[model samples]
Target: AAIRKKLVIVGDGACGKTCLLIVNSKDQFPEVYVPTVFENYVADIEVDGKQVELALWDTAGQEDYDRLRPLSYPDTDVILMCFSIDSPDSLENIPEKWTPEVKHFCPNVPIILVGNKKDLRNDEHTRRELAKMKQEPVKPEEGRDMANRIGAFGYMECSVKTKDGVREVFEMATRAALQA
Candidate 1:
Protein backbone atom coordinates (compact mmCIF):
# COMPACT_ATOMS: atom_id res chain seq x y z
CA ALA A 1 0.00 0.00 0.00
CA ALA A 2 1.10 3.57 -0.69
CA ILE A 3 0.67 6.25 1.90
CA ARG A 4 0.56 9.93 1.01
CA LYS A 5 2.13 12.69 3.07
CA LYS A 6 2.45 16.41 2.76
CA LEU A 7 5.70 18.16 3.60
CA VAL A 8 6.03 21.90 3.52
CA ILE A 9 9.47 23.58 3.46
CA VAL A 10 9.94 27.08 4.81
CA GLY A 11 13.01 29.24 5.22
CA ASP A 12 14.67 32.45 4.14
CA GLY A 13 14.93 33.28 0.44
CA ALA A 14 17.80 31.67 -1.48
CA CYS A 15 18.36 29.31 1.41
CA GLY A 16 18.13 26.40 -1.08
CA LYS A 17 14.58 25.32 -0.29
CA THR A 18 13.55 24.84 -3.94
CA CYS A 19 16.85 23.27 -4.85
CA LEU A 20 16.35 20.58 -2.26
CA LEU A 21 12.99 19.63 -3.73
CA ILE A 22 13.98 19.94 -7.39
CA VAL A 23 17.18 18.04 -6.87
CA ASN A 24 15.60 15.19 -4.95
CA SER A 25 12.52 14.92 -7.09
CA LYS A 26 13.95 15.69 -10.52
CA ASP A 27 17.62 15.03 -9.95
CA GLN A 28 18.59 18.21 -11.74
CA PHE A 29 20.52 21.19 -10.45
CA PRO A 30 18.85 24.30 -11.72
CA GLU A 31 21.19 26.97 -13.08
CA VAL A 32 18.94 30.03 -13.13
CA TYR A 33 17.48 31.18 -9.84
CA VAL A 34 13.90 32.34 -9.90
CA PRO A 35 12.13 33.37 -6.73
CA THR A 36 9.38 30.90 -5.95
CA VAL A 37 6.01 32.36 -5.08
CA PHE A 38 4.44 28.98 -4.47
CA GLU A 39 5.04 25.56 -6.00
CA ASN A 40 4.10 21.95 -5.35
CA TYR A 41 5.79 18.71 -6.35
CA VAL A 42 4.98 15.06 -5.86
CA ALA A 43 7.81 12.67 -5.12
CA ASP A 44 7.25 8.93 -4.85
CA ILE A 45 9.57 7.46 -2.26
CA GLU A 46 10.28 4.03 -0.87
CA VAL A 47 10.76 3.95 2.88
CA ASP A 48 10.98 1.06 5.30
CA GLY A 49 9.77 -1.27 2.55
CA LYS A 50 6.66 0.81 2.10
CA GLN A 51 5.76 3.02 -0.84
CA VAL A 52 5.18 6.63 0.06
CA GLU A 53 3.89 9.52 -1.97
CA LEU A 54 5.39 12.75 -0.68
CA ALA A 55 3.69 16.00 -1.53
CA LEU A 56 6.31 18.73 -1.38
CA TRP A 57 5.30 22.36 -1.03
CA ASP A 58 7.88 25.03 -1.79
CA THR A 59 7.09 28.47 -0.40
CA ALA A 60 8.61 31.88 -0.86
CA GLY A 61 10.51 33.29 2.08
CA GLN A 62 10.30 36.98 1.24
CA GLU A 63 8.25 39.29 3.40
CA ASP A 64 6.07 40.00 0.44
CA TYR A 65 4.71 36.48 0.70
CA ASP A 66 4.27 36.48 4.44
CA ARG A 67 0.57 37.15 4.05
CA LEU A 68 0.16 34.34 1.54
CA ARG A 69 2.57 31.58 2.55
CA PRO A 70 0.53 30.03 5.30
CA LEU A 71 -2.14 29.10 2.78
CA SER A 72 -0.11 25.96 2.25
CA TYR A 73 -0.09 25.01 5.91
CA PRO A 74 -3.46 23.35 6.13
CA ASP A 75 -3.22 19.60 6.85
CA THR A 76 0.56 19.57 6.67
CA ASP A 77 2.10 16.24 7.66
CA VAL A 78 5.54 17.60 8.44
CA ILE A 79 7.55 20.75 8.00
CA LEU A 80 11.07 20.92 6.67
CA MET A 81 12.36 24.13 8.19
CA CYS A 82 15.49 24.82 6.19
CA PHE A 83 18.42 27.19 6.64
CA SER A 84 21.67 27.60 4.79
CA ILE A 85 24.86 26.39 6.46
CA ASP A 86 26.66 29.21 4.67
CA SER A 87 24.28 31.91 5.91
CA PRO A 88 24.25 32.70 9.60
CA ASP A 89 21.40 35.15 9.30
CA SER A 90 19.23 32.44 7.78
CA LEU A 91 19.70 30.24 10.84
CA GLU A 92 19.03 33.18 13.12
CA ASN A 93 15.78 33.72 11.28
CA ILE A 94 14.55 30.19 12.08
CA PRO A 95 13.54 31.01 15.64
CA GLU A 96 12.98 34.66 14.82
CA LYS A 97 10.82 33.96 11.81
CA TRP A 98 9.90 30.43 10.59
CA THR A 99 9.28 28.47 13.79
CA PRO A 100 6.66 30.88 15.08
CA GLU A 101 4.82 31.01 11.80
CA VAL A 102 4.71 27.24 11.37
CA LYS A 103 3.66 26.75 14.96
CA HIS A 104 0.93 29.29 14.55
CA PHE A 105 -0.60 27.59 11.55
CA CYS A 106 0.21 23.96 12.17
CA PRO A 107 0.81 23.69 15.88
CA ASN A 108 0.99 19.92 15.95
CA VAL A 109 2.94 19.34 12.78
CA PRO A 110 6.39 17.80 13.17
CA ILE A 111 9.38 19.83 12.04
CA ILE A 112 12.78 18.76 10.69
CA LEU A 113 15.52 21.34 10.69
CA VAL A 114 17.59 21.16 7.53
CA GLY A 115 20.98 22.81 6.99
CA ASN A 116 21.40 23.29 3.25
CA LYS A 117 24.58 24.08 1.34
CA LYS A 118 26.70 22.04 3.70
CA ASP A 119 29.39 21.80 1.06
CA LEU A 120 30.24 25.43 1.66
CA ARG A 121 30.49 25.04 5.40
CA ASN A 122 34.20 24.28 5.05
CA ASP A 123 34.95 25.44 1.53
CA GLU A 124 37.95 27.72 1.46
CA HIS A 125 36.46 30.40 -0.74
CA THR A 126 33.21 30.38 1.16
CA ARG A 127 35.09 30.59 4.43
CA ARG A 128 37.11 33.52 3.18
CA GLU A 129 34.01 35.34 1.96
CA LEU A 130 32.14 34.81 5.22
CA ALA A 131 35.22 35.88 7.19
CA LYS A 132 34.94 39.30 5.55
CA MET A 133 31.58 39.60 7.28
CA LYS A 134 32.86 38.02 10.48
CA GLN A 135 30.53 35.08 9.97
CA GLU A 136 31.24 31.38 9.71
CA PRO A 137 29.24 28.51 8.25
CA VAL A 138 26.80 26.93 10.63
CA LYS A 139 28.08 23.85 12.41
CA PRO A 140 26.19 20.55 12.74
CA GLU A 141 26.11 20.99 16.49
CA GLU A 142 24.49 24.37 16.07
CA GLY A 143 21.88 22.79 13.81
CA ARG A 144 21.17 20.02 16.30
CA ASP A 145 20.99 22.56 19.12
CA MET A 146 18.51 24.67 17.23
CA ALA A 147 16.44 21.62 16.34
CA ASN A 148 16.30 20.61 19.98
CA ARG A 149 15.30 24.10 21.04
CA ILE A 150 12.62 24.24 18.37
CA GLY A 151 11.34 20.70 19.10
CA ALA A 152 12.17 19.46 15.65
CA PHE A 153 11.98 15.72 15.02
CA GLY A 154 15.54 15.76 13.65
CA TYR A 155 18.28 17.91 12.19
CA MET A 156 19.91 17.13 8.87
CA GLU A 157 22.70 18.74 6.84
CA CYS A 158 23.00 18.48 3.07
CA SER A 159 24.48 20.08 -0.03
CA VAL A 160 22.49 20.07 -3.28
CA LYS A 161 25.64 20.67 -5.31
CA THR A 162 27.44 17.70 -3.84
CA LYS A 163 24.30 15.49 -3.67
CA ASP A 164 25.38 14.50 -0.21
CA GLY A 165 22.74 13.76 2.39
CA VAL A 166 20.02 14.93 0.05
CA ARG A 167 18.11 11.65 -0.06
CA GLU A 168 18.33 11.28 3.69
CA VAL A 169 16.58 14.59 4.22
CA PHE A 170 13.46 13.45 2.39
CA GLU A 171 13.59 9.98 3.86
CA MET A 172 13.74 11.40 7.34
CA ALA A 173 10.92 13.75 6.54
CA THR A 174 8.84 10.82 5.34
CA ARG A 175 9.42 8.94 8.56
CA ALA A 176 8.57 12.01 10.59
CA ALA A 177 5.45 12.52 8.54
CA LEU A 178 4.36 8.95 9.07
CA GLN A 179 4.81 9.32 12.79
CA ALA A 180 3.17 12.70 12.91
Candidate 2:
Protein backbone atom coordinates (compact mmCIF):
# COMPACT_ATOMS: atom_id res chain seq x y z
CA ALA A 1 0.00 0.00 0.00
CA ALA A 2 1.12 3.56 -0.71
CA ILE A 3 1.17 6.46 1.74
CA ARG A 4 -2.33 7.85 2.04
CA LYS A 5 -3.04 11.59 2.23
CA LYS A 6 -6.10 13.82 2.07
CA LEU A 7 -6.80 16.64 -0.37
CA VAL A 8 -9.82 18.79 0.32
CA ILE A 9 -11.21 21.28 -2.21
CA VAL A 10 -13.41 24.23 -1.25
CA GLY A 11 -15.16 26.84 -3.36
CA ASP A 12 -18.54 28.23 -4.34
CA GLY A 13 -21.17 25.62 -5.25
CA ALA A 14 -21.04 26.69 -8.86
CA CYS A 15 -17.25 26.66 -9.16
CA GLY A 16 -16.92 23.30 -10.95
CA LYS A 17 -14.90 21.78 -8.11
CA THR A 18 -16.52 18.38 -8.44
CA CYS A 19 -15.95 18.21 -12.16
CA LEU A 20 -12.24 18.86 -11.64
CA LEU A 21 -12.03 16.05 -9.15
CA ILE A 22 -14.19 13.69 -11.16
CA VAL A 23 -12.43 14.51 -14.34
CA ASN A 24 -8.98 13.87 -12.99
CA SER A 25 -9.73 10.94 -10.72
CA LYS A 26 -12.53 9.16 -12.55
CA ASP A 27 -11.44 10.13 -16.06
CA GLN A 28 -14.93 11.32 -16.95
CA PHE A 29 -16.40 14.61 -18.00
CA PRO A 30 -19.73 14.62 -16.22
CA GLU A 31 -21.26 17.92 -17.27
CA VAL A 32 -24.42 17.55 -15.25
CA TYR A 33 -24.61 18.91 -11.74
CA VAL A 34 -24.99 16.73 -8.69
CA PRO A 35 -25.11 17.13 -4.93
CA THR A 36 -21.49 16.64 -3.84
CA VAL A 37 -21.92 17.01 -0.11
CA PHE A 38 -19.15 14.58 0.92
CA GLU A 39 -17.82 12.77 -2.14
CA ASN A 40 -14.39 11.12 -2.07
CA TYR A 41 -12.02 9.73 -4.73
CA VAL A 42 -8.59 8.18 -4.71
CA ALA A 43 -5.79 9.54 -6.90
CA ASP A 44 -2.62 7.50 -6.91
CA ILE A 45 0.20 9.50 -8.34
CA GLU A 46 3.99 9.60 -8.40
CA VAL A 47 5.50 12.93 -7.66
CA ASP A 48 9.27 13.37 -7.78
CA GLY A 49 9.93 9.68 -7.14
CA LYS A 50 7.42 9.26 -4.32
CA GLN A 51 4.18 7.32 -4.66
CA VAL A 52 1.14 8.60 -2.83
CA GLU A 53 -2.52 7.88 -2.64
CA LEU A 54 -4.21 11.25 -2.49
CA ALA A 55 -7.72 11.00 -1.20
CA LEU A 56 -9.58 13.75 -2.98
CA TRP A 57 -12.48 15.18 -1.03
CA ASP A 58 -15.12 17.27 -2.80
CA THR A 59 -17.07 19.10 -0.13
CA ALA A 60 -20.37 20.67 -1.07
CA GLY A 61 -20.49 24.47 -1.18
CA GLN A 62 -24.19 25.26 -0.91
CA GLU A 63 -25.42 27.08 2.17
CA ASP A 64 -27.35 24.00 3.26
CA TYR A 65 -24.20 21.87 3.36
CA ASP A 66 -22.06 24.39 5.21
CA ARG A 67 -22.48 22.67 8.55
CA LEU A 68 -21.91 19.19 7.22
CA ARG A 69 -18.89 20.11 5.16
CA PRO A 70 -16.54 20.40 8.12
CA LEU A 71 -17.26 16.81 9.03
CA SER A 72 -14.84 15.88 6.24
CA TYR A 73 -12.16 18.40 7.17
CA PRO A 74 -10.55 16.83 10.21
CA ASP A 75 -7.54 15.14 8.60
CA THR A 76 -7.01 17.21 5.49
CA ASP A 77 -3.35 17.27 4.43
CA VAL A 78 -3.72 19.80 1.61
CA ILE A 79 -6.39 22.24 0.54
CA LEU A 80 -7.51 23.21 -2.95
CA MET A 81 -9.19 26.59 -2.58
CA CYS A 82 -11.02 26.76 -5.88
CA PHE A 83 -13.00 29.30 -7.93
CA SER A 84 -14.44 29.32 -11.42
CA ILE A 85 -12.69 31.51 -13.99
CA ASP A 86 -16.09 32.53 -15.33
CA SER A 87 -17.40 33.90 -12.03
CA PRO A 88 -15.76 36.77 -10.23
CA ASP A 89 -18.14 36.29 -7.34
CA SER A 90 -16.82 32.77 -6.82
CA LEU A 91 -13.32 34.18 -6.69
CA GLU A 92 -14.47 36.81 -4.20
CA ASN A 93 -16.00 34.12 -2.02
CA ILE A 94 -12.61 32.36 -1.81
CA PRO A 95 -11.11 35.07 0.40
CA GLU A 96 -14.23 35.63 2.47
CA LYS A 97 -15.81 32.18 2.56
CA TRP A 98 -13.41 29.47 1.39
CA THR A 99 -10.19 30.80 2.88
CA PRO A 100 -11.77 31.64 6.23
CA GLU A 101 -13.50 28.30 6.50
CA VAL A 102 -10.50 26.13 5.53
CA LYS A 103 -8.08 28.07 7.71
CA HIS A 104 -10.39 27.77 10.68
CA PHE A 105 -10.55 24.00 10.44
CA CYS A 106 -7.33 22.90 8.72
CA PRO A 107 -4.78 25.23 10.17
CA ASN A 108 -1.25 24.98 8.70
CA VAL A 109 -2.46 22.87 5.82
CA PRO A 110 -0.87 24.17 2.61
CA ILE A 111 -3.63 25.65 0.48
CA ILE A 112 -3.59 25.82 -3.33
CA LEU A 113 -5.62 28.38 -5.26
CA VAL A 114 -7.20 26.77 -8.29
CA GLY A 115 -9.04 28.60 -11.05
CA ASN A 116 -11.35 26.06 -12.67
CA LYS A 117 -13.11 26.38 -16.04
CA LYS A 118 -10.08 27.87 -17.70
CA ASP A 119 -11.64 27.30 -21.10
CA LEU A 120 -14.28 29.91 -20.45
CA ARG A 121 -11.87 32.71 -19.72
CA ASN A 122 -12.06 33.94 -23.31
CA ASP A 123 -15.28 32.38 -24.55
CA GLU A 124 -17.56 34.99 -26.04
CA HIS A 125 -20.66 33.27 -24.73
CA THR A 126 -19.39 33.27 -21.18
CA ARG A 127 -17.80 36.68 -21.46
CA ARG A 128 -20.93 38.24 -22.91
CA GLU A 129 -23.14 36.68 -20.27
CA LEU A 130 -21.07 38.09 -17.45
CA ALA A 131 -20.55 41.41 -19.21
CA LYS A 132 -24.28 41.89 -19.35
CA MET A 133 -24.27 41.48 -15.59
CA LYS A 134 -21.60 44.19 -15.27
CA GLN A 135 -18.67 41.86 -14.66
CA GLU A 136 -16.01 39.87 -16.45
CA PRO A 137 -14.38 36.52 -15.94
CA VAL A 138 -11.77 36.24 -13.22
CA LYS A 139 -8.44 36.90 -14.83
CA PRO A 140 -5.32 34.70 -14.53
CA GLU A 141 -3.22 37.41 -12.98
CA GLU A 142 -5.95 37.92 -10.43
CA GLY A 143 -5.65 34.30 -9.35
CA ARG A 144 -1.88 34.59 -9.00
CA ASP A 145 -2.32 37.70 -6.86
CA MET A 146 -4.90 35.85 -4.81
CA ALA A 147 -2.56 32.93 -4.22
CA ASN A 148 0.04 35.35 -3.00
CA ARG A 149 -2.45 37.21 -0.81
CA ILE A 150 -3.66 34.03 0.84
CA GLY A 151 -0.21 32.46 1.35
CA ALA A 152 -1.19 29.65 -0.98
CA PHE A 153 1.46 26.97 -1.53
CA GLY A 154 0.69 26.91 -5.25
CA TYR A 155 -1.56 28.42 -7.88
CA MET A 156 -2.95 26.49 -10.82
CA GLU A 157 -5.67 26.70 -13.44
CA CYS A 158 -7.59 23.96 -15.20
CA SER A 159 -10.44 23.28 -17.62
CA VAL A 160 -12.24 19.99 -17.10
CA LYS A 161 -14.03 20.36 -20.40
CA THR A 162 -10.77 20.76 -22.23
CA LYS A 163 -8.83 18.59 -19.74
CA ASP A 164 -5.98 21.02 -19.57
CA GLY A 165 -3.60 21.47 -16.65
CA VAL A 166 -5.83 19.55 -14.28
CA ARG A 167 -3.62 16.69 -13.11
CA GLU A 168 -0.79 19.03 -12.32
CA VAL A 169 -2.92 20.35 -9.48
CA PHE A 170 -3.08 16.93 -7.83
CA GLU A 171 0.61 16.40 -8.50
CA MET A 172 1.46 19.57 -6.66
CA ALA A 173 -0.99 18.64 -3.96
CA THR A 174 0.64 15.24 -3.51
CA ARG A 175 4.05 16.83 -3.26
CA ALA A 176 2.79 19.20 -0.61
CA ALA A 177 0.97 16.42 1.18
CA LEU A 178 3.99 14.12 1.35
CA GLN A 179 6.30 16.87 2.53
CA ALA A 180 4.10 17.30 5.57
Candidate 3:
Protein backbone atom coordinates (compact mmCIF):
# COMPACT_ATOMS: atom_id res chain seq x y z
CA ALA A 1 0.00 0.00 0.00
CA ALA A 2 1.13 3.56 -0.73
CA ILE A 3 0.10 7.11 -0.16
CA ARG A 4 -1.16 8.75 -3.30
CA LYS A 5 -0.25 12.22 -4.58
CA LYS A 6 -1.12 14.31 -7.62
CA LEU A 7 1.25 16.59 -9.54
CA VAL A 8 0.27 19.02 -12.26
CA ILE A 9 2.78 20.67 -14.60
CA VAL A 10 1.99 23.99 -16.31
CA GLY A 11 3.76 26.31 -18.70
CA ASP A 12 3.68 27.70 -22.23
CA GLY A 13 3.41 25.38 -25.18
CA ALA A 14 6.71 23.87 -26.41
CA CYS A 15 8.45 25.07 -23.25
CA GLY A 16 9.68 21.50 -22.59
CA LYS A 17 6.89 20.04 -20.44
CA THR A 18 6.07 17.04 -22.63
CA CYS A 19 9.68 15.99 -23.08
CA LEU A 20 10.17 16.25 -19.34
CA LEU A 21 7.23 13.92 -18.74
CA ILE A 22 8.20 11.48 -21.49
CA VAL A 23 11.76 11.24 -20.26
CA ASN A 24 10.86 10.82 -16.59
CA SER A 25 7.99 8.38 -16.98
CA LYS A 26 9.14 6.29 -19.95
CA ASP A 27 12.93 6.77 -19.98
CA GLN A 28 12.58 7.66 -23.64
CA PHE A 29 13.47 11.17 -24.80
CA PRO A 30 12.46 11.88 -28.35
CA GLU A 31 12.77 15.65 -27.85
CA VAL A 32 9.09 16.29 -28.51
CA TYR A 33 5.63 17.82 -27.84
CA VAL A 34 2.29 18.00 -29.61
CA PRO A 35 0.14 20.35 -27.48
CA THR A 36 -0.79 17.75 -24.91
CA VAL A 37 -4.18 18.58 -23.36
CA PHE A 38 -4.41 16.20 -20.44
CA GLU A 39 -1.93 13.36 -20.60
CA ASN A 40 -1.77 11.26 -17.45
CA TYR A 41 0.69 8.73 -15.99
CA VAL A 42 1.47 6.92 -12.80
CA ALA A 43 4.82 6.22 -11.15
CA ASP A 44 5.54 4.41 -7.94
CA ILE A 45 8.32 5.39 -5.59
CA GLU A 46 9.65 4.43 -2.17
CA VAL A 47 11.40 7.54 -1.08
CA ASP A 48 11.26 9.38 2.24
CA GLY A 49 10.82 6.10 4.11
CA LYS A 50 7.38 5.40 2.65
CA GLN A 51 5.76 4.20 -0.53
CA VAL A 52 4.22 6.78 -2.81
CA GLU A 53 1.96 6.19 -5.78
CA LEU A 54 2.07 9.38 -7.82
CA ALA A 55 -0.33 10.59 -10.47
CA LEU A 56 1.35 12.82 -13.04
CA TRP A 57 -0.95 15.12 -14.95
CA ASP A 58 0.33 16.88 -18.04
CA THR A 59 -1.87 19.80 -19.03
CA ALA A 60 -1.84 21.63 -22.33
CA GLY A 61 0.11 24.88 -22.37
CA GLN A 62 -1.66 26.32 -25.36
CA GLU A 63 -4.07 29.23 -25.07
CA ASP A 64 -6.70 27.01 -26.62
CA TYR A 65 -6.70 24.93 -23.51
CA ASP A 66 -6.59 27.78 -21.03
CA ARG A 67 -10.31 27.56 -20.24
CA LEU A 68 -10.12 23.81 -19.78
CA ARG A 69 -6.79 23.22 -18.00
CA PRO A 70 -8.10 23.92 -14.53
CA LEU A 71 -9.99 20.64 -14.64
CA SER A 72 -6.66 19.07 -13.72
CA TYR A 73 -5.95 21.44 -10.86
CA PRO A 74 -8.59 20.69 -8.22
CA ASP A 75 -6.82 17.99 -6.24
CA THR A 76 -3.22 18.69 -7.12
CA ASP A 77 -0.82 18.18 -4.24
CA VAL A 78 2.11 19.83 -5.97
CA ILE A 79 2.78 21.97 -9.00
CA LEU A 80 5.64 21.92 -11.48
CA MET A 81 5.83 25.38 -12.98
CA CYS A 82 8.10 24.64 -15.93
CA PHE A 83 9.75 26.85 -18.54
CA SER A 84 12.40 26.35 -21.14
CA ILE A 85 15.79 27.86 -20.30
CA ASP A 86 16.15 29.14 -23.82
CA SER A 87 12.80 30.84 -23.65
CA PRO A 88 12.76 33.67 -21.12
CA ASP A 89 9.28 34.46 -22.32
CA SER A 90 8.17 31.18 -20.85
CA LEU A 91 9.56 32.08 -17.45
CA GLU A 92 8.06 35.55 -17.67
CA ASN A 93 4.69 34.00 -18.15
CA ILE A 94 5.06 32.03 -14.94
CA PRO A 95 4.01 35.09 -12.99
CA GLU A 96 2.06 36.81 -15.71
CA LYS A 97 0.11 33.77 -16.84
CA TRP A 98 0.76 30.44 -15.14
CA THR A 99 1.17 31.48 -11.53
CA PRO A 100 -2.11 33.41 -11.28
CA GLU A 101 -4.08 30.57 -12.78
CA VAL A 102 -2.40 27.98 -10.58
CA LYS A 103 -2.87 30.03 -7.44
CA HIS A 104 -6.48 30.68 -8.26
CA PHE A 105 -7.15 27.00 -8.72
CA CYS A 106 -4.70 25.35 -6.34
CA PRO A 107 -3.67 27.72 -3.62
CA ASN A 108 -1.45 26.41 -0.82
CA VAL A 109 0.02 23.72 -3.06
CA PRO A 110 3.78 23.69 -3.22
CA ILE A 111 5.18 24.74 -6.58
CA ILE A 112 8.57 23.68 -7.91
CA LEU A 113 9.65 26.15 -10.53
CA VAL A 114 11.49 24.05 -13.08
CA GLY A 115 13.74 25.33 -15.82
CA ASN A 116 13.74 22.80 -18.62
CA LYS A 117 16.16 22.73 -21.61
CA LYS A 118 19.26 23.25 -19.50
CA ASP A 119 21.37 21.72 -22.25
CA LEU A 120 20.53 24.54 -24.59
CA ARG A 121 21.48 27.38 -22.27
CA ASN A 122 24.96 27.51 -23.71
CA ASP A 123 24.37 25.74 -26.99
CA GLU A 124 25.97 27.37 -29.99
CA HIS A 125 22.86 27.31 -32.09
CA THR A 126 20.52 28.21 -29.26
CA ARG A 127 22.69 31.16 -28.24
CA ARG A 128 22.94 32.38 -31.80
CA GLU A 129 19.21 32.15 -32.28
CA LEU A 130 18.42 34.07 -29.08
CA ALA A 131 20.85 36.78 -30.04
CA LYS A 132 18.82 37.25 -33.17
CA MET A 133 15.90 38.10 -30.88
CA LYS A 134 18.23 40.35 -28.82
CA GLN A 135 17.75 38.13 -25.80
CA GLU A 136 19.68 35.39 -24.04
CA PRO A 137 18.73 32.14 -22.42
CA VAL A 138 17.22 32.44 -18.96
CA LYS A 139 19.87 32.28 -16.25
CA PRO A 140 19.94 29.89 -13.29
CA GLU A 141 20.16 32.55 -10.62
CA GLU A 142 17.35 34.49 -12.23
CA GLY A 143 15.22 31.39 -12.05
CA ARG A 144 15.91 31.06 -8.33
CA ASP A 145 15.09 34.71 -7.78
CA MET A 146 11.82 34.31 -9.61
CA ALA A 147 10.99 31.28 -7.53
CA ASN A 148 11.57 33.30 -4.41
CA ARG A 149 9.32 36.05 -5.69
CA ILE A 150 6.60 33.56 -6.47
CA GLY A 151 6.99 31.87 -3.10
CA ALA A 152 7.76 28.62 -4.84
CA PHE A 153 8.82 25.63 -2.83
CA GLY A 154 12.00 25.31 -4.94
CA TYR A 155 13.72 26.27 -8.14
CA MET A 156 15.50 23.71 -10.34
CA GLU A 157 16.96 23.30 -13.82
CA CYS A 158 17.19 20.20 -15.97
CA SER A 159 17.31 19.05 -19.55
CA VAL A 160 15.31 16.06 -20.69
CA LYS A 161 17.97 15.04 -23.19
CA THR A 162 20.91 15.88 -20.96
CA LYS A 163 19.41 13.88 -18.08
CA ASP A 164 21.03 16.17 -15.55
CA GLY A 165 19.07 17.20 -12.48
CA VAL A 166 15.98 15.52 -13.84
CA ARG A 167 15.78 12.86 -11.16
CA GLU A 168 16.54 15.44 -8.53
CA VAL A 169 13.47 17.32 -9.70
CA PHE A 170 11.39 14.18 -9.28
CA GLU A 171 12.83 13.59 -5.84
CA MET A 172 12.16 17.19 -4.93
CA ALA A 173 8.58 16.88 -6.09
CA THR A 174 8.23 13.68 -4.13
CA ARG A 175 9.40 15.49 -1.05
CA ALA A 176 7.14 18.46 -1.66
CA ALA A 177 4.11 16.31 -2.42
CA LEU A 178 4.57 14.25 0.68
CA GLN A 179 5.03 17.34 2.78
CA ALA A 180 1.95 18.97 1.34
Alpha-carbon local distance difference test for all models: 0.89, 0.86, 0.86
Predictions: Cα RMSD each: 1.7, 1.8, 1.9
What is candidate 1's lDDT per residue for 36-149, written digit by digit as tens?
524467878888898999888889999999999989899999999999999999999999999999999988899999999999988999899999999899989999999989
Q: Candidate 2, residues 30-113: lDDT per residue as tens digits?
A: 566665624557888998777788888888898888899999899899998899999998998888888888999999999989
Please give, for residues 1-180, the per-residue lDDT of candidate 3 as tens digits. Answer: 799999888999888886676665654434554556245677676786889877888888888888888988988998999999999889899999989899999989999999999999989999999999899999999999999999999999998877999888878888899985
Please state the error at residue 171 of candidate 2 in Å. Answer: 0.7
TM-scores vs. true structure, each candidate: 0.93, 0.93, 0.93
TM-score of 1: 0.93
> Which has the higher TM-score value, candidate number 1 or candidate number 2?
1
**In TM-score terms, which candidate is top?**
1
Clash number for candidate 3? 0
Error of 2 at 25 (Å): 3.8
Candidate 3 residue-wise lDDT at 10: 92
Clashing pairs in 1: none
Q: With candidate 2 superimposed using the best TM-score fit, by how many Å does residue 134's alpha carbon deviate from the native?
A: 2.3
